Structure formats: structure tokens, C-alpha cells
Design a binder for this molecule. Structure first.
Ligand SMILES: NC(=O)c1ccc[n+]([C@@H]2O[C@H](COP(=O)([O-])OP(=O)(O)OC[C@H]3O[C@@H](n4cnc5c(N)ncnc54)[C@H](O)[C@@H]3O)[C@@H](O)[C@H]2O)c1
Ligand SMILES: NC(=O)c1ccc[n+]([C@@H]2O[C@H](COP(=O)([O-])OP(=O)(O)OC[C@H]3O[C@@H](n4cnc5c(N)ncnc54)[C@H](O)[C@@H]3O)[C@@H](O)[C@H]2O)c1
Ligand SMILES: NC(=O)c1ccc[n+]([C@@H]2O[C@H](COP(=O)([O-])OP(=O)(O)OC[C@H]3O[C@@H](n4cnc5c(N)ncnc54)[C@H](O)[C@@H]3O)[C@@H](O)[C@H]2O)c1
Ligand SMILES: NC(=O)c1ccc[n+]([C@@H]2O[C@H](COP(=O)([O-])OP(=O)(O)OC[C@H]3O[C@@H](n4cnc5c(N)ncnc54)[C@H](O)[C@@H]3O)[C@@H](O)[C@H]2O)c1
Ligand SMILES: Cc1c(CN(C)C(=O)/C=C/c2cnc3c(c2)CC[C@@H](N)C(=O)N3)oc2ccccc12
Ligand SMILES: Cc1c(CN(C)C(=O)/C=C/c2cnc3c(c2)CC[C@@H](N)C(=O)N3)oc2ccccc12
Ligand SMILES: Cc1c(CN(C)C(=O)/C=C/c2cnc3c(c2)CC[C@@H](N)C(=O)N3)oc2ccccc12
Ligand SMILES: Cc1c(CN(C)C(=O)/C=C/c2cnc3c(c2)CC[C@@H](N)C(=O)N3)oc2ccccc12
Lengths: 259, 258, 259, 258
């Protein structure tokens, strides 16, 4: 049996076979986890139901984390089949597209800031609030961050602030929920060509740069991220909580490799 | 003094205890000309009195919850200072019920929204509204706290909002550097100001810090004021995007209390 | 088969059943790795040979990392049975005991500094130099650090500087060896009652403090560290290099939990 | 100036390009009295000339490889300054063959030993030898580089030695804080001094930094000098154990060159 046997894990954020959440789901399934899936809106319904069935799952529930009621209804439905479960993968990041091009100070707005932080940071702890009493001891929560939290990256703009808020959220959630038996961590992934790359100019040349200066001399895949994610939601990682694990091939720890 | 010739807007003076009050005094002592904002009609009279005591006549209302308030303020400011040399952002707020008890239970969507809006977005909101008024060589400063970087009991959603604010420092420094503007923060140690109002065990916390801080005291608004004046002066020309810890070394020690 | 099948990993630093290296070895063995072991001096010979046999291993070699010749001879012997292999666990830390009590500036000496850095930092890259041509693509190197690298901890003294040197060593080794297919990481472990706790005053009260303020409300074990270590030397962690992973239950990411 | 009344020992002046030369000039300009050390007989005449130009007569040999040299120096210094207010450590060295090529191939046990001995241990060696001579309010300063925190090509074992040095800053600040002594570092951006001698592609590196640094220039010894003077002055009373980046914001940006 895999190292996720006996675990029930909810996975958010599967939008396509390219999604980081899809790679996480595949690895967790390979390691024996029973999975449940959410989807943002009705456009993704049929599609996520198909990915879920491939991964042994009947449990496919609508959840728009902009709305407290949607989160509450989704966990009420999940509780009909999983009265308790062992944690969830938060793989949800969003800012209005106009925020992510151009000079940051000119591009950012109060509303773009509000949405980026609400959807990409608040929603992680919103989900934890709503399922807190359903978690078993040994449970693990996981979210996905990016180096733009720690460094100023061109065009990433207000998403960098939202990810910095999210990484702090990881620490405060880990500190609050640890005593009752829940761990909370993040993977800071290197850039991956997913739907989150849509309309981001210079994304090809950006991946080429990472490929050149990353110590392992390739960019990471959703399979790399999936394997680390399965570890971090498994009991193998029982000694890790509140941690942001860089799964970017070492990109963040080198400088001036370009020359 | 080493701010002679600079014109610096100071937000956030609420009482003689305020961090911004200590910053303004230090900056005045080093020769800056100062302008002041006040949040609301409750605070106007105090800020006018303090401003007058530092030789300033420029006291303008600004509630950073409202874009129009920030715009109107900088329009008024431009009648007397068509250009100036930066501003001190000393504004932090979350609804008080956010700052008591288990973080996951206390946080709400609205408390989160407000904390991030008032404590983080307002810094770049201000920079947006005065960007064309900044001289080359200008400096912007904000105040952060160790709760950005570590989980501190009861600081709760303010820690996320400060983490957003420190990233804002980096993004703003990266964006405005090429125009000649630096952006930095001070991560101050705890100080008993109005920001301690209603906070559980604040005195026990200060006693802890005073015992484990390397300099064996907690910091004052004089200590923060002196570092702020440096970070807004041309002496710090080599420093941008930085969060400077002005906490007596508290953050760099561990298990000091065994 | 376990997630370390087809891997050959050399393990340094087993001194007793309490050693962090012993917990790492047990987990790697459980996950299907073939192991080889070193021992510092002849006092540990019989004992390490016994731990190794329990873990399926005939390969037990002397190695004192103070001496380049000892490291070279040991890898020449290892190459008779493992012409190539897949990485090693560096679990070796030492400073003269007088360095680790009292005010740091009064306790530290040039010689105590020299030894602490030589044995606890240089030896990691010494070992990599000496076996570089024996590593397969996919190989992984791992060392053990401690929070005293990042924070000033009473009495840890010059070992804090040596661990900071070691964590930088992790980054420079990862950057140099990544392109040929080798990853290099560290675990920063929370405190564990091992022989490395010998003669450290206040170690009981220190563990009690960690137990109280760690988010998971217990101190970590060599089994926690072993499971993370097996992950970091496995292909599951193919996207991680140059990283210092905190396996301390979240201790480092909280502050003022005491109150 | 803001160092009036302070007496500061400055190590590491080797040429007008040295970081320590810029520090000494800034400190003199702010009113400190200065004393100087020189490594060896080769450097004596230059350091005496520079010292005389800054009104100092206190020029003492000190090779931090030797405990007796440090002791003898502080014995000599105590004949004129029985107490003083801290020192600037601006000393970094690895054998040059360590600083070229693949790190794992270039590093050796002896090159490692020397880099850590001269660049890191010597800072606490100096503090040990003058500890009883430091006034309350004293400040110690050293110079680090981003290679402590990130793997930089060719910087090689100097990056480990700087990481050891920054931990030394923390441990020294923690140990000496309660006596009234602060200890900090400046992590300076690259500067073309004698420390660039023989270094591969140093000019290409500076061009890179000047393109991606937020302030769009590399830093000068004037920039570092001004920050050093602040960190050794009572204006920085709230700051100890800190590594202050004086690199124009270079370290806080990423992928700026796309
Ligand atoms: N792709 C990268 O380069 C990269 C690198 C590091 C981190 N990340 C982060 O990884 C996570 C997954 O992104 P991805 O790259 O897999 O792209 P993706 O577009 O496939 O996944 C993003 C998902 O967020 C979901 N989502 C957005 N708003 C939502 C809402 N209101 N309610 C519910 N769900 C909502 C979307 O439906 C989608 O399933 C994001 O947080 C992203 O910021 C991406
Ligand atoms: N006191 C500490 O321990 C401490 C330590 C580190 C950082 N900080 C931060 O320093 C800053 C100044 O806090 P303080 O300790 O001086 O307390 P304070 O209460 O004196 O000052 C906070 C100021 O924020 C202003 N403000 C709040 N909401 C506003 C709004 N919508 N528009 C305009 N102004 C608004 C208030 O009027 C007040 O002037 C805050 O950002 C605080 O988070 C405080
Ligand atoms: N025990 C803790 O609290 C803790 C926490 C974090 C990190 N660490 C680090 O974990 C690693 C393992 O320590 P441990 O706690 O398992 O204690 P241990 O005493 O069981 O292991 C230390 C090992 O280092 C070996 N060693 C020392 N000098 C050597 C030399 N010259 N040549 C070859 N080997 C030598 C010793 O023989 C011993 O096997 C060390 O690096 C330690 O600093 C320990
Ligand atoms: N130039 C840069 O790009 C840069 C950037 C950041 C930090 N640094 C660091 O700043 C410091 C000053 O370097 P610099 O750029 O001014 O170059 P420099 O060559 O002018 O100064 C280095 C000084 O170290 C002294 N020194 C070397 N070995 C010594 C010994 N055994 N005893 C006494 N003194 C010894 C030398 O005599 C010289 O005065 C070094 O620590 C350097 O690592 C340099
Ligand atoms: C790398 C990198 C990424 C990927 N990544 C780490 C993310 O977190 C991407 C979040 C992201 C959030 N909101 C978005 C979009 C993307 C665009 C699609 C559409 N969904 C949209 O309207 N809004 O995005 C970048 C943006 C600018 C610069 C660099 C990057
Ligand atoms: C230290 C420390 C501080 C001071 N400090 C760093 C801050 O940033 C304090 C921001 C803060 C924001 N909003 C607040 C208040 C304070 C309380 C008064 C009233 N103004 C209120 O309703 N809302 O506050 C803490 C709160 C909990 C635990 C520790 C601390
Ligand atoms: C925690 C903690 C540890 C454990 N730990 C993380 C280590 O890395 C311990 C390394 C260590 C190195 N050298 C030592 C010894 C230990 C003592 C046994 C004997 N082997 C000796 O002569 N020299 O040690 C501490 C020392 C002081 C304060 C706190 C701690
Ligand atoms: C930047 C940068 C620097 C400058 N700098 C931050 C330093 O700390 C430079 C220390 C340094 C230590 N020892 C040295 C030398 C220099 C060379 C001259 C001679 N003095 C020598 O034999 N030994 O050096 C680099 C070396 C490689 C790559 C990048 C850099």
C-alpha cells in the first residue's frame, strides 16, 4: 500500500490536465489516498468529474471560495460521505488579469488588491475554518505559493503581496491548529506552463531563463510538485509544519548564474 | 541636520506615544520640513497642535480607506509643496475582534479585508497618488512588525497584513527605483502606544522582550525615529526594498529564556 | 517496493541507536535502499557493523573526516563493491566541548572555531569532492543542520557559525553539482536527545520548552527526521535542491508562544 | 556630526578604493575620532598617510591571523584610548585559487580554513581582545556579501565564510548586548575595489547589477560609508544582530533581466 493509505484528502483547483492540482491528485492517488475534488463553477463540472473518476473518486463538489456560503455548502455535502477526513490541498490563486502586466505601482488598484488577497490568501484559512471540526488528528493542509512572495518579480505585481499574505497564513494556521493535530505547509513551486500562464507575456522566455540558471538545469513539473505535495500531506512529514518548501529546482538559492 | 532640505509628509500621528510622533520629532531635529495628515475630525486638533510645535502649518485630512481622500489630500499638499521628498506611512489597523484568541477562529473575510486594505494597500495607494510629485532622491517608509515573519499569538490577521506590506515594500522599491525613489520598512519591536489598546498580556509581552532582547530593553519611539530619519535621508542612498529590524535584536535570538 | 528501491546510499554518523543517522538508516532501509555505513574510529567498529547487518548491509568502513586520506581510502574501499552509488547522508557535527558552555565571546577560541568548522562544515564538501565521480545521475546528498545557524542560541556558540557555514555549503554544492545530476539539501532538525546532548546543561528544560511552544506540541524524533531524510534522498524530491528543510515541528516559525 | 564624541578603530584600509576608506571618511565627516590598523609592512605607509589626512596619529599593525598581533595592537591602542566606542572590521580573504571555477573542485581544506579564519573568526577574535575596553553604547560593524545567502558563481568558499560571519554577528550581538555593545553587519553590493583583483568577469557582473538593481546603479564606498557611520552611531541604538543590505535593492529582485 502507498504512503497515503487510509487518508482521505480533498483537492481543489483542478482546471485541466496541466493544473498543479492535477499532478498532486495523480501522485496522491498513486500513493493510495482516497480523493475528493472541488470545482469553481459549472464550466468545470463535467471535466473535473472525469478527472476524479479516473482517480477512483465519486466525490466532485462545487466550491467558489469567494463566497462563505459556497464553502459551507460544499463541506456540508462532503460530510455526508466523509464525516471526517485528513486535510485538503489549496491550489487556488487569482488576480484580475490587468493587475499582472506592467509597472506594479501603476497597475495595482484597491479592488485588484482586494480580490487577489481574498481569493489567493483568505480562502485558504476560510476553507480551514469551515472544515476544522471534520479533520482527524494527523491531518495536513497544503497550499501553493511562488517566489514572488519573497522577491519583487516583474509583472507578478499584486499577486506577490497576496502570496506573501498566504505564506504568513501558513504560519498562523500551523500555529493555531497544530495543538489539535493538524499540520499546515506550502510548496513554493517554480514556474509551470499551466492555465495560470495564460496571457502572461514573456512566459516562454521566462521558463528558458529558469531552465538556464536553476541548479538542476530544468524547470519543475506538476509531477515534481505532486510528489512533494503527497509527501507533505502524508505522515512521512509528521515533523514539518508551518514550512514553505521550495520545489523550484534550487532556482531561488542561486544568483548571477546568468553570467 | 542630515535631513536639511528635505520635505517629508508624516501620517499616523495619534498621540505623543505614536511611533510617527517619534519619527516626526527626530526628523524635525535633523532639519526636515514636515507636513502632517490626520485620519478624521477626532484627531485634527491634536495633530494641528503637534504640527505647530514642530513649526509646520501643513495639516491635512486623509483617510486611507478612500481613494478620493488620498487624492484630495495630495491635491491640497501640492498647493504648498508642488514636489516633495517622500512620506512616512505609520498606519496599521484591524477590527479589534480580530486580535484576540485562536487565529483561525477569530479571522473573518471582512476582518481580513480591512486589515490588508488599511495596513498594506494604503501604502501603495499613497505612492500612486503622489508619484509625479516625488523628487529624485525621494524615500518612502512604512512600519512593520515581526508578526509578518513569525506566528505570534493574538496578532492574528495583522501578521498576514504585515507580510503583504513587506512584499509591497519590495514591489514598490522595484517599480519606483528607476525614477529615483527608495522604499523601505522598519520592523519595530513592541512599543506601548495606542496600538496596544485592548491587547491581552501586552505588559507580559514587553517584560518578555525586555528579558530576551540582546540590548536588554525594549525599543522606544526615539529609537525608531532615529532609524526612520536615516532611512528617509540621503545617508541611506544605498538601501532600498529593505525591512530593517529596529527591535534591539529580539528577532535574532532563540531560547534565550532558559 | 519502497520509494528508495534501486538506490545505494552511504550513511555516516551512526554512533548509537539514538543517533539521527540511525533513524535515517532505518527509514531508508524500510523504503528499500541498499545501505553502506561509515564509523569514526575503532571504538565504534563493532556496533556500527551490528547496526549495518540488521539493515541488510555488509559494507562498514572507517572514516574520520578530519583527514583527507581517510575519506579517500574509504571511498576507494566503497568503490570495490559500489563502483557507483546514489548519494550519502552527512550526519557529523563536532566542536570541542568547552566551546559549548557559557558566554560565546568568552568561550570561543581560534582552535575551537577551526575544528567546529572543519568537522561540521568542510567535511560535507570534502566527502562530495572525494566521491563526485562515483555518483549516478539522480543522486542526492543530505546533511543535518540546526536552528542555531539562523538564530543566536545560548551555549550553542561556535557550532551556530559552523552550521551557518554548512547551510551555505548546501547551496554552493547544490549549485555546482546540480548540472551533472546531483541534488544537495539539509534538514534543520529540532533538538533530539542523542549523544550530541551529552554534557549540554539544561537539555531537559530545553526539550520541555520546545515541547510547549512547538506548533505540534511535541519534540521531533529520529523517526520524523528519518522519514523526511528518506524523502529528500529519493526521487520523490527531484524538484528540491539547495534547500534547508525545517523538521522541527514548526518551532522556528512561532514566537512568544511562551506567554 | 552624529558621531561626535565617539572613538572608532577602523581596520582594512588598503587603498582609496577600500570600503574601509569610505567608512573612515564618512565617520570623520560626522565627527568621530579615528584610529587605524594595517595588515603588514607593505601597507603601513599608505595607512599612515590616509590617517594623517583624517587627523589621526593612531596607526597600529594588526594581522588578524595571529592572536598575539591582535593583543599587542589593543595593548598599544589602550595607551592612547583606554576605552573606546567600537571598531569596523573590513577584512575578508581566501587564497585566490579558491575563487575561480566550480566550487566543489576549487575548495580545499586549507583554503576553507583560511577563508573562515581570516574572514569570520577574526571578527570575534578582535571583540575578545578589546571587550573590557568598550564603553557602554559601543558598536561593532563588519562587512558581508550576498554570497552568504545565495550561491554565486566563483565566490565559492568565501560564501561559506560570510555565512559564518553573519552568524558571528548574531552570536556576538546576543553575548555582548547586555554589556551595552551592539554588533551588526552591512551586506554591501559589489564594488570594484582591490577585492575584485583577478576576479573573472567582475565588470560583466557590475553591468548586470547596474541593470537589475532597483536604484539602477551599483553602490559606492560613499553609500556604504554613510550606512556604516549610522550603524556605529547612537542613532542606530535600536539595531543589533542585523545584516543591513546596502546593495541598492539588488537582493530583493528576481528575473528583472527578462
Ligand atoms: N503555474 C505556476 O507557474 C505556479 C507556480 C507556483 C505557484 N502557482 C500557484 O499554484 C496554484 C495552482 O495554479 P495552476 O498553475 O495549477 O493554474 P490553474 O489555473 O490550473 O489552477 C488555478 C485554479 O484556481 C481555481 N480558482 C480560481 N478562482 C477560484 C475561486 N474563486 N474559487 C474556487 N477556485 C478558484 C481555478 O478554477 C483553477 O482550478 C495557484 O495558487 C498558483 O498561484 C502556480
Ligand atoms: N506599537 C507597536 O508595538 C508597533 C510595533 C511595530 C509596528 N507597529 C506599526 O506602527 C504603526 C504606527 O502604530 P503606533 O504604534 O504608532 O499606534 P497609533 O495608534 O499611535 O498609530 C496608528 C495610526 O494609524 C492611523 N490610522 C488607522 N486607520 C487609518 C485610516 N483608515 N486612515 C488614516 N490613518 C489611519 C491612526 O489614526 C493612527 O494615527 C502601525 O502600522 C503599527 O502596525 C507598531
Ligand atoms: N541531536 C540534536 O538535537 C540535533 C538537532 C539538529 C542537528 N543535529 C546534528 O545532527 C547530526 C548528527 O548528530 P546526532 O544528534 O545524531 O548525535 P551523534 O553524536 O549520535 O552523531 C554525531 C556523529 O558525528 C560523528 N563524528 C564526529 N566527529 C567525526 C569525525 N571526525 N569523523 C567522522 N565522524 C565524526 C560521530 O562519530 C557521531 O557518529 C550532527 O551534525 C548534529 O549537529 C543534532
Ligand atoms: N568589494 C566588494 O564588492 C565587497 C562587497 C561586500 C563585502 N565586501 C567585503 O568588504 C571587506 C573590505 O573589502 P574591500 O572591498 O574594501 O577590499 P580591500 O582589499 O580594499 O580590503 C580588504 C582588506 O582586508 C585586509 N586583510 C586581509 N587579510 C588580513 C589579515 N590577515 N589581517 C588584517 N587585515 C587583513 C586587507 O589588508 C585589506 O585592507 C571584505 O570583508 C570584503 O569581503 C566587499
Ligand atoms: C510565474 C508567473 C505566474 C504563474 N503563477 C506563479 C501564478 O501564481 C499565476 C497566478 C495568476 C493569477 N491570476 C491570473 C493569472 C495568473 C492569469 C490567468 C487568468 N487566470 C487571470 O485572469 N488571472 O503568473 C505570473 C504573472 C506575472 C509574472 C510571472 C508569473
Ligand atoms: C505587539 C502587538 C501589537 C502592536 N502592533 C505591532 C501593531 O501592529 C498593532 C496593530 C493594531 C491594529 N489594529 C488594532 C489594534 C492594533 C488595537 C487597537 C485598536 N486600534 C484596534 O481596534 N485595532 O498589537 C498586537 C496585537 C496582538 C498581539 C501582539 C501585538
Ligand atoms: C540543541 C543543542 C545541541 C544538539 N545539536 C543541535 C548539536 O548540533 C550538537 C552538537 C555537538 C557538537 N559537539 C559536541 C557536542 C554536541 C557535545 C557532545 C560531545 N560530542 C562534544 O564534545 N562536542 O547541542 C547543543 C549545545 C549547546 C546548546 C544547545 C544544543
Ligand atoms: C563580488 C565579488 C567579490 C568581492 N567581494 C564581495 C569579496 O568579498 C572579495 C573577497 C576576496 C577574498 N580574498 C581574495 C579576493 C577577494 C581576491 C583578491 C585577492 N585579495 C585574493 O587573493 N583573495 O569577490 C568575488 C569573487 C568571486 C565572485 C564574485 C566576487
Amino acid at each position: 500500500m502507498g504512503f497515503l493509505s487510509g487518508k482521505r484528502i480533498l483537492v481543489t483547483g483542478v482546471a485541466s490536465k496541466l493544473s498543479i492540482a492535477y499532478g498532486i491528485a495523480q501522485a496522491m492517488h498513486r500513493e493510495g489516498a482516497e480523493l475528493a475534488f472541488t470545482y469553481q463553477n459549472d464550466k468545470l463540472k463535467g471535466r473535473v468529474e472525469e478527472f476524479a473518476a479516473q482517480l477512483g473518486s465519486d466525490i466532485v463538489l462545487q466550491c467558489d471560495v469567494a463566497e462563505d456560503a459556497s464553502i459551507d455548502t460544499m463541506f456540508a455535502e462532503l460530510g455526508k460521505v466523509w464525516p471526517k477526513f485528513d486535510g485538503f490541498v489549496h491550489s487556488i490563486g487569482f488576480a484580475p488579469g490587468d493587475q499582472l502586466d506592467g509597472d506594479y505601482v501603476n497597475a495595482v488598484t484597491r479592488e485588484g488588491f482586494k480580490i487577489a488577497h481574498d481569493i489567493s490568501s483568505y480562502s485558504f484559512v476560510a476553507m480551514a475554518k469551515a472544515c476544522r471540526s471534520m479533520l482527524n488528528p494527523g491531518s495536513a493542509l497544503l497550499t501553493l505559493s511562488y517566489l514572488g512572495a519573497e522577491r519583487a518579480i516583474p509583472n507578478y505585481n499584486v499577486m506577490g503581496l497576496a502570496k506573501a499574505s498566504l505564506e504568513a497564513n501558513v504560519r498562523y494556521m500551523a500555529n493555531a491548529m497544530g495543538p489539535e493535530g493538524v499540520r499546515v505547509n506550502a510548496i513554493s513551486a517554480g514556474p509551470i506552463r499551466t492555465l495560470a500562464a495564460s496571457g502572461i507575456k514573456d512566459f516562454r522566455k521566462m521558463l528558458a531563463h529558469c531552465e538556464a540558471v536553476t541548479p538542476i538545469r530544468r524547470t519543475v513539473t506538476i509531477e515534481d510538485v505532486g510528489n512533494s505535495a503527497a509527501f507533505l500531506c502524508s505522515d512521512l512529514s509528521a515533523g514539518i509544519s508551518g514550512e514553505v518548501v521550495h520545489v523550484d529546482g534550487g532556482f531561488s538559492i542561486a544568483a548571477m548564474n546568468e553570467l
